[PDB]
Paper text:
Microbial rhodopsins that are extremely distantly related to animal visual rhodopsins comprise an expansive family of seven transmembrane proteins that contain a covalently attached cofactor, retinal. Upon absorption of a photon, retinal isomerizes triggering a series of structural transformations that correlate with functional and spectral changes and are known as the photocycle. Here we present a structural and functional characterization of [name] rhodopsin II ([name]), a representative of the second group of viral rhodopsins. Examination of the crystal structure, functional characterization and molecular dynamics (MD) simulations suggest that [name] is a pentameric light-gated channel that is functionally analogous to well-studied pentameric ligand-gated ion channels playing crucial roles in many cellular processes.
The crystals diffracted up to 1.9 Å, and the structure of [name] was solved at 1.9 Å. Similarly to other microbial rhodopsins, each protomer of [name] is organized as a bundle of seven transmembrane helices (A−G) connected by relatively short loops. The retinal cofactor is covalently bound to Lys195 through the Schiff base (RSB), and the electron densities indicate that the chromophore is in all-trans conformation. [name] consists of only 211 amino acids and is the smallest among microbial rhodopsins with known crystal structure. Thus, the following amino acids play the key role in the formation of the pentamer: Glu26, Arg36, His37, Asn40, Trp203, and these amino acids are highly conserved within group II of viral rhodopsins, but not in other rhodopsins. The narrowest section (vestibule) of the pore is formed by the Phe24, Leu28 and Arg29 of helix A and has the length of 11 Å and mean diameter of 6 Å. We assigned it to a short hydrocarbon chain that plugs the pore. In [name], the putative proton donor Glu42 is located in helix B (which corresponds to Thr46 in bR) and thus juxtaposed to the RSB.
Author numbering:
A (entry chain E): 1 to 212
B (entry chain A), D (entry chain B), E (entry chain D): 2 to 211
C (entry chain C): 3 to 211
Write the structure that this text describes.
């Protein structure tokens, strides 16, 4: 419907407020400093993404779908590095109970990440063909997730986390190719999973809320 | 009419109250299990408060029907958190540990979203309103049957179960009514189901009442 | 003029009171004091919200409408204020913030009887004189019940007395025309919410000799 | 006009700074007396920042005389808090306990409000400005006489007492000026009397300066 | 065209990020010297975010020269905090105590305000643009000479000193450029000088990198 399109913006916006609140409160109370650092970063992701969604929502009346998708890049440029830092710190917490990563390794991750995003952007503004942007983008994505895989030690949380990021982030590249309207809706739903459900997972995991 | 406006403000203002009370106690309780429950409760008030502020802001720009359709977005976010709180509280009251089996929680959510989804489909004409009611209440039955299996008897658990049972059933009753009185009813139900329940959790864990 | 200033004075004092109780609620090592200051913070939060609304409207709305709107604020703040009062009595008498729920429900019943009958009088469903008479009957029940929970001591007596007088004065100002009644209620809120809030903070913080 | 615009924004932004720094430290200091002082200082910034945001929002329909009259509502709230901070600071500097006699503080407030009240009556013409100045300054003297009696000799106490005496006296001096320079002067005095004093307390108790 | 507007949003949103991260760690670190640094860092993000929200508000009908003039108010508040952080950071890295001589800090501020003030006179045409450039950079030299004397050698201090040196000098470079490129340059420099520096402090004290 016209309804469900607008609803997708609100759903993600409100779930970002939920995720931001839950990680904020636990970041302020966890006794584990490494968990605090992860939950602190996670709060920042929700804060930033919520800001951009509030902008999008403020423009719904005369919505320009293409404009919105281009604006998302500003959000992505800020949140993707934070999300990736969280991922690699979490790998290490799961292995050694300390949040640490080599800065050099992290800069290589970011290089691949920004190659991926920058290529996507060049395609959207027509500096390169969209088709080329897609393939070159996915190549950088491959470099990103290969490098990520080298920092991962095998265990249930690390495998789920890696697998979730792999699939969710790949789907951005899939939705990239769609028309502006369905692309927006897909991205809204992907953000709900990649930011909010991931954040809620981190909280629930460290809080030991669930028995498997 | 005027009823609509006052009832919106009442619930909105009480959500601020509930959110503040649970936030402060989440940050200061020495019991981590209570923190998790009160943290979740704070999320509920934050999300609902956002929706109420939006409804109030748009009151002269949207109709009663649209507001009721929009509530589903709020419900889609708040109902799962509320149910998580419920089942976590069940265990906290028994063992002082906030845990539930993820599989049990996913079954709870399945029933919850069948309830909400079939209600929504009836509301938008995809199925007959009356089927919305029947299927909704059938899923409601599944939901509370499953909740009951995780309820262990004690005073608090029984009160909580009963309160949820009655309040949540009443949403299905007000679903029957015309758009205006339905809005007012939902406003008041939210006051009870989110705000007064949230204050109960606070007061219960704070040992405010004998 | 000073009718608009009175709105700002109370609004700004609510911000002060809310800030002061918030920070101390978050730092006190006494859990009972935390519960009381937590509730006090809520009172300031809610009343501040309604005052920001009244202020946003001073051009667009008549003074009767503002007074009727206050009942929504009152319906929320009064039960929290009463809960604080009985918990404070209890803290003085037992070092613990507790009350019997049944006792609190009786208190709330009297309170809403009082507010409800007052409201009915304000909107003309019953006469103003009947609103006052029934209102004060419920007021009497309320303050009678409150007194049965009160043990004698400096703080409990000061508190009980403060509430008794300040709350009776709402019923006094109820008799006035709409404009002075607004100024009156603004000043009473400053006392009943803000100065009481500040009292609790100062008392538990042992700021004064 | 520009001068007064820029000076509004300067003080407003510095109030945000001061409120943030005292807020965070009030929440973490292990000294309860310092907490009370920093809590109070936070309130001062919150209130004054509210009023400055108001002045700023009024700029496009600005009435300089109106701004100066509105300041009295701010002063009526912030001055008692500032004075309470001052006398508690005196005591902390000697016994490390934030306490004062209620009766002493009520006398302080009596003088403070005589001062503000008579100044106000002069501004709105109930009495002549000159009579406002004379009464105002007499109340100022009573206030600072009483303040001085609660003051123990001490490096911090002396700097504080002197800073307050001078800065507060200057409000009475700018009261005499035409509305424009009066506003700019008040904006800068507020910067010193609220913000710089607030940052002093933080820095002093945090021991960041040798 | 897009990139210019985007540069405001990037820095604004990164300020929100930096403010959040230092706020949470300020409230939880067990080292109070680190708290004081992170407290100050939070203030910087709060103040700059306020001004960036203002600029973003003005993008439709944007006057590039006005914005750059407006920035001086931001600068007048944030630069002294940033310099305080820098010198406390020097000491914390060497002694693990956040302390500086007040006299040293006032000399630093003298130079800092000489730099900003002369730069401002150049912009508003009271002195020629190349003059402001030359004199401003003289004060900058004084500032960074003095800072260097407070610096003791080590990895973090050398990095911090070099980053501040280069970034702050670059404000002087972009000062020569036309209003539009100058805005974009300042937006990016603020990202580095406030946000990336603040994130560095957080990461450094949290020891998340090796
Ligand atoms: C909605 C998305 C939230 C998904 C979160 C559900 C996964 C939680 C889990 O697997 O439990 C981890 C425990 O073993 C840790 O003690
Ligand atoms: C992107 C923002 C730039 C942040 C740069 C972060 C570098 C922090 C670092 O060098 O680690 C310090 C170690 O010695 C462990 O404490
Ligand atoms: C919260 C926002 C997130 C996690 C955004 C992630 C964005 C991507 C993973 C984009 C990926 C792309 C490709 C893999 C191909 C090229 C086009 C892109 C940039 C959409
Ligand atoms: C805070 C909001 C809450 C707790 C909403 C709960 C909503 C329901 C329990 C809705 C129930 C319904 C039925 C039981 C029948 C079908 C129609 C519904 C969805 C209104
Ligand atoms: C913060 C607001 C407060 C404490 C409001 C209290 C309001 C009352 C005590 C009203 C009392 C009334 C009567 C005692 C008689 C009838 C009229 C009323 C409702 C104003
Ligand atoms: C934050 C605001 C402050 C500290 C305001 C203080 C105001 C005064 C000290 C005003 C003093 C006056 C006199 C001493 C003479 C009469 C006129 C007054 C009210 C301006
Ligand atoms: C967050 C904002 C910051 C760190 C601003 C710093 C501003 C400067 C370092 C300005 C320097 C200038 C000169 C060195 C000479 C030319 C004029 C100035 C003021 C732009
Ligand atoms: C609206 C964004 C969600 C709020 C959750 C974060 C809690 C506040 C932290 C400060 C962020 C600014
Ligand atoms: C040894 C470090 C190598 C870093 C290479 C990639 C750096 C690019 C960082 C991304 C910025 C866009
Ligand atoms: C690398 C992602 C490109 C999208 C544009 C980001 C905006 C940068 C502002 C300068
Ligand atoms: C070995 C485990 C592999 C699991 C892959 C799962 C991919 C599912 C993608 C859905 C994302 C759900 C979000 C969960 C947050 C973690
Ligand atoms: C007319 C609008 C059509 C919108 C099509 C987009 C549908 C939503 C995309 C679903 C993505 C879900 C990803 C979850 C995987 C785990
Ligand atoms: C509009 C507020 C409704 C809920 C109040 C929640 C209390 C604060 C939540 C923390 C966010 C920072
Ligand atoms: C126990 C197996 C898990 C049951 C899956 C049901 C989850 C449905 C959630 C609906 C969301 C739309
Ligand atoms: C196990 C129960 C599954 C319920 C299906 C209903 C899901 C509705 C999705 C919207
Ligand atoms: C001890 C209480 C447990 C009761 C759980 C049973 C829930 C049944 C709810 C009634 C089902 C409604 C079916 C109506 C069809 C339309
Ligand atoms: C006390 C001195 C200030 C007088 C004027 C400002 C306060 C106005 C409050 C309105 C009175 C009710
Ligand atoms: C909206 C809930 C915010 C909780 C913090 C309370 C701070 C008190 C300020 C009250 C005045 C607004
Ligand atoms: C045993 C006494 C319990 C009496 C309950 C009081 C009924 C009044 C309820 C009013 C709440 C609105
Ligand atoms: C025995 C206690 C009786 C107190 C309850 C009084 C009920 C008053 C009605 C208020 C509802 C409006
Ligand atoms: C709690 C102190 C704040 C209220 C101010 C007092 C005004 C009401 C008069 C109280 C009467 C006391 C009883 C002796
Ligand atoms: C009506 C005049 C009263 C003025 C008293 C002034 C007292 C100042 C203290 C010396
Ligand atoms: C207490 C620090 C506040 C700084 C403000 C300085 C304003 C100058 C006041 C001069 C008084 C000096 C003491 C004699
Ligand atoms: C065009 C308006 C110009 C009038 C400027 C008058 C402002 C005087 C500056 C205030 C100085 C007081 C600060 C003293 C600190 C000790
Ligand atoms: C609520 C006290 C101020 C702390 C702010 C912490 C979050 C950073 C704010 C950046 C501005 C957006
Ligand atoms: C637009 C005017 C900016 C001039 C730059 C120099 C700033 C001097 C004023 C200092 C005010 C802040 C006091 C700390
Ligand atoms: C104008 C320049 C002022 C003088 C700058 C002195 C530089 C001191 C040595 C710096 C060492 C750099 C390490 C990074
Ligand atoms: C851009 C021109 C700068 C000339 C002055 C250099 C002196 C500063 C020393 C470093
Ligand atoms: C980044 C290196 C640290 C600063 C060293 C000082 C550089 C002096 C250059 C001044 C003239 C160009
Ligand atoms: C050695 C200085 C080189 C300047 C690099 C500028 C990048 C700043 C990053 C912030 C880290 C502090
Ligand atoms: C108009 C173009 C001006 C660009 C200024 C470049 C500085 C930022 C580089 C990234």
């Amino acid at each position: 419907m016209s309804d469900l399109i607008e609803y997708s913006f609100y759903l993600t916006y409100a779930f970002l407020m939920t995720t931001g609140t839950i990680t904020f409160i636990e970041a302020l109370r966890t006794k584990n400093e490494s968990v605090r650092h992860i939950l602190n970063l996670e709060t920042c992701i929700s804060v930033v993404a919520a800001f951009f969604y509030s902008n999008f929502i403020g423009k719904l009346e005369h919505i320009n779908y293409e404009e919105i998708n281009l604006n998302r890049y500003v959000d992505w440029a800020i949140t993707t590095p934070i999300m990736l830092l969280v991922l690699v710190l979490a790998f290490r917490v799961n292995q050694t109970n300390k949040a640490m990563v080599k800065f050099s390794d992290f800069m290589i991750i970011l290089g691949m990440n920004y190659g991926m995003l920058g290529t996507g952007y060049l395609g959207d503004i027509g500096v390169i063909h969209k088709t080329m942007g897609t393939v070159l983008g996915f190549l950088f994505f491959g470099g990103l997730f290969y490098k990520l895989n080298t920092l991962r030690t095998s265990n249930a949380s690390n495998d789920l986390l890696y697998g979730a990021f792999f699939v969710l982030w790949a789907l951005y590249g899939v939705f990239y190719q769609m028309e502006q309207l369905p692309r927006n809706v897909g991205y809204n739903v992907l953000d709900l999973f990649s930011k909010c459900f991931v954040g809620i997972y981190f909280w629930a995991f460290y809080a030991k809320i669930f028995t498997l």
